């Protein structure tokens, strides 16, 4: 907070106060399984199903 001081009046102290907070960490994954037939079909026909 600010303080209003007259000429030659005593100046106080008012200070910021703090506290710390910590995160957690998460690992997230998606695994999708398909035949190599699905790969050769997609890739030769250019369907874009693996891109999808």
């Amino acid at each position: 907070r600010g303080e209003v001081v007259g000429e030659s009046a005593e100046k106080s102290e008012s200070t910021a106060t703090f506290a710390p907070v910590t995160s957690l960490v998460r690992k997230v994954q998606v695994t999708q399984r398909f035949s190599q037939e699905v790969k050769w079909a997609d890739e030769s026909r250019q369907l874009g199903v693996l891109q999808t």
Binding site: T15, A16, T17, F18, A19, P20
Partner: protein, 51 residues
């Protein structure tokens, strides 16, 4: 109140490198020379008794 670093709960500085006790090396590799060998059991021929 004056601000002190306890209010920050500062994390430690993890320094690079690992300190290790020494390990004893092979004695046989210094005391006996490696002969060049092909893969599989070698056979050596020995005198058993003299004439």
């Amino acid at each position: 109140a004056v601000l002190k670093t306890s209010s920050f709960q500062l994390p430690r500085h993890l320094v690079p490198g690992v300190w290790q006790k020494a390990q004893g090396q092979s004695v046989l590799a210094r005391l006996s020379n490696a002969e060049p060998q092909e893969f599989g059991e070698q056979q050596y021929m020995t005198l058993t008794a003299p004439p």
